Symmetry: D2
Subunit: 334 residues, 4 copies
């Protein structure tokens, strides 16, 4: 399939040589290759897109990124620097590249203003945030976005009518020490990533974010970070036990997955899991994505192009869902 | 289908009735009925079994159980007390009721001896443990069982050749405060339970427990506590990235699910997820279970009895897999 | 779920006392209740709709119906009689009942004119035809609609922009005797029905009906009459073998199922097969239906309402697909 | 996966090479290659097996084969010729090649005697028959095997305890004229094949063949010739409607699929349909198959080797179900010449 759209696609700031090499060494068997590709915006990245039937990618800042920065002024300065950098870096290829906003999430009003700045000025397509904001004087705390103090931010997101991609981050601080340090091969894609995002997303559900902000679109990578596996079980326990005991969110978990939540295929090129999600989530709410350069184009795209599924859903998941959700202009081979 | 076998089926101690009823306020819409049913062994429990086609259930101590007790002497005494209690309580129904061992997991040698004691004396079918053992100052510490100090325990488990059921427990202490207190509707079946068990089970995988103890059978409830959903993703990251970087476990995740792991249908009466698991896990390693009394018999058994799947797999999952695994 | 739409729902003419008795003797355990329910249009049928959350049903003439009549003038007269009868019988329930055209398919131009007559005069939502038209002396011949001479009829269907539901018919004549008489319990839903419809519908594909008429919408019951089970196998043999050897289809079989074909859940209340069809066909092309009164409302509707599937597709399949495809107005 | 076993794998007689090459013009893009490969037993065939991880194949006579021959004496003589031919042709490779019996099915006792002859003398693994036997004048009649006169045959099959593979055959004669001549692109794999076998197999079910012969094992290719798609629909209509009206078979359709029927993956390299069949049929009754040379080894084996399903079911379907059902030699894989 030509003209696919992918949107969990990372870049790094070239000056961050040590940080990029550190993350590369934890996520890639060839870390110098990883570094070259996460730094490149317009050369190898577009050659891969041309080679593998990808018309358009929406770029986002690497994890942990700004969500690792616990000093609010340093975090804000890095978010601004990243946003200005990537807007300029993609300027030559508006037919191939868009960007998501990078945000410091220490303060709701500040994040709202920066999101508004770069969506309005640069035409960014939404925001991508690496789960909770690392915080505290020494980086031991974390900020979730499901409390009412974030209403001023979520109302900006819905006023702009752009999605928010809730990406994972590595575990840090006392949580890292107590749960993960002694089984550290589970940090990242094997388990820790999905546990963080699913906690936060279901926090958004059960703490009323989607009730207060019913137009809000939240995107989850990796086929939904475990959640569809338990769609039956979560729904049974919410509807039959937790709501009788006081849970007051207005809709069912299935209704939130129909109206507010999306899942992507990033890093999860599983035909069997995708077929399962056709039932539990539905092709209208599933988006192709790669997770480049943590994943390579060939793996994602040979898998997707090879899917022996119906042509309507293959087109929707491959590009047409994203074209409508992100209001995309005509892009290469759209 | 008649003669079904279920094995994530809880009881509590009668002397804890008030405590039991207090805690039931968070997960039972009728806490008085929940306390009555969890304390009952041979009356209502067997009546439900007879009415819903359950020939045999293996009973286990309710969560958090002994894993909530951070004083080692008190924990050990309670495990002993519970094991003797349930052996005596079920003794008149050998054809309908078995038991899993209850253990204090503060000390590997201590836990191995108590497991050996009750398996040999009472014919218990295995052990069931509610995830990590609370310990340390004020019970804020957590004991996982994937470190080398637990080899002496796992060696006793395989010597006895009985399975070990890794059951969830609620988050406690500072972890509870940091992650769950502000989104507490997610505590239990909605999310926290599976996050705990999958962390611990995949710690056993990656820290080599099944390589040092290849006979070991670990049973997971709730269709595998998220793990089968990511069978492809875990496998890809383990084989293609983590092992080249240094991960040293000898088998693939799929190989551990064929040799060492089992999943049950407890609290997960999902034809959709079960079908997905038929491909990713396989009918030979899936066991029916209920999670009574947090779940009721009618929900679990109406679902399973109505499953429109092939005859041979339905019988394997409903009873024959468990008959052979636990040698009933 | 409330407001469901069903559209493989049959009626008979009340004067046909014996032809209803015969058909019921093969496919119904209570011939009395069957006759009473297939004859009813506004009473027990709306009672069932009210008890089971069905907002609207599109009614169609029983099988084999007009396709059993090999005398063209008797066949055309029955299609006219049926079309006037049902349009009258449903007129006081426009928020609950619609109708498909009944057609004699002896002649493309004749059938076209009658379809245009009843769509224009009564607002019928399409046509429903019970597979091939019996023809010739004794009625042993069969008229298929995939030849170029049917272009004027399919051109009418796409001009009116209404769907054509290709319903099964029993096996008759020499074919019945040679293949079905000595294994007659397979006649109908067990096997014969799907073998007829799949032959005809795949005839339309490979003889170019959808290439000449790209806007044409054909609806198949019973989750597609076996075809989705072989979507991979048909696709492989068409693309890799039949097309190098002459098959001139512009599109793949999957593309025709995306653009021209639909399937319904009539008489196939199988969660297993539906889930499989979400992959092979897709929720946008699947329609709830019952096959009343051969099936009862309770079986179809307790199954559908109970489906533990995503909310978007449950709404689309249950009602919203049909609302858009049949340009249904406000109803409940 | 090495050591895979396939068993819908055809050959033709060399003396028919010109007729074979002609007919391949309709179902092979390179009919010269098709004729060369369907006529070869030990060279290219085994080379493909070596290259693609196939340890063992059971060979059978191509369709329509003896079922096309409506003179009973000619058909019997051909079946005998074919059986002696293939037994001799495969005899040096017992760890790579087995054979199914080829039968004339004009007369039950004659067919039973030939099946017994070649199972006993040659160690054939079962029978493979291309649906109904052409009979009568002009060969326009059809002999089905679900009537009571075939009981003597099915008792021989269960006494020998070998399976019977019910393979398709092209439509012929008047049925071909009436239904398929004007939509000839549906003849074969696209539709006609499955319609024939499913009618015949469900005739066996509803006419009580598996009640009179409960040990009988019938194998269906192409993931069951449509039938599992309608497992729910067939079961509902059998149990709730047709049995009250007089259908007298004793078990459900699911019970026959657990006890008497097998399906193979021949010509149906569909992860989607296979997964569906895991639920409706179960991995214990599913067998890998290729349908060579109509299908090529690369298509079947790259698909099967790439399947991301649980290890145990993959081994059962790929070889272990067949190793037990057809009593393959222990250590046969030591001869697999794997690359
Ligand atoms: Zn990522
Ligand atoms: Zn439990
Ligand atoms: Zn009907
Ligand atoms: Zn074949």
């Amino acid at each position: 399939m030509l003209g696919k759209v992918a949107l969990e696609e990372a870049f790094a700031l070239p000056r961050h040589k040590e940080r990029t090499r550190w993350w590369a060494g934890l996520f890639a068997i060839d870390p110098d290759k990883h570094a070259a590709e996460i730094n490149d915006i317009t050369e190898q990245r577009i050659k891969y897109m041309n080679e593998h039937g990808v018309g358009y990618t929406i770029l986002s800042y690497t994890a942990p990124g700004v969500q690792d920065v616990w000093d609010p002024k340093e975090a804000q300065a890095l978010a601004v620097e990243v946003n200005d950098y990537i807007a300029d870096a993609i300027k030559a290829h508006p037919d191939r590249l868009g960007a998501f906003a990078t945000l410091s999430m220490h303060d709701p009003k500040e994040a709202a203003e920066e999101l508004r700045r770069v969506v309005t000025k640069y035409g960014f397509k939404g925001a991508l945030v690496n789960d909770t904001q690392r915080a505290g004087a020494d980086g031991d705390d974390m900020i979730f976005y499901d409390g009412p103090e974030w209403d001023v931010f979520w109302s900006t997101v819905t006023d702009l009518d752009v999605p928010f991609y809730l990406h994972p981050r590595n575990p840090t601080g006392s949580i890292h020490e107590k749960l993960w340090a002694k089984r550290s091969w589970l940090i990242g894609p094997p388990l820790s990533f999905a546990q963080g995002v699913s906690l936060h997303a279901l926090g958004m559900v059960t703490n009323g974010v989607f009730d207060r902000h019913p137009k809000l679109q939240i995107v989850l990578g990796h086929l939904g970070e475990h959640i569809p596996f338990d769609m039956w079980r979560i729904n049974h326990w919410f509807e039959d036990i937790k709501k009788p005991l006081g849970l007051s969110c207005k809709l069912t978990i299935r209704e939130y997955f129909a109206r507010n939540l999306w899942i992507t295929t990033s890093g999860h090129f599983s035909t069997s899991t995708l077929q399962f999600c056709l039932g539990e989530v539905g092709a209208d709410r599933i988006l192709f994505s790669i997770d480049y350069p943590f994943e390579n184009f060939s793996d994602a795209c040979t898998w997707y192009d090879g899917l022996a599924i119906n042509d309507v859903d293959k087109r929707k998941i491959g590009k047409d869902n994203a074209k409508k959700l992100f209001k995309l202009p005509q892009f290469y081979q759209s």
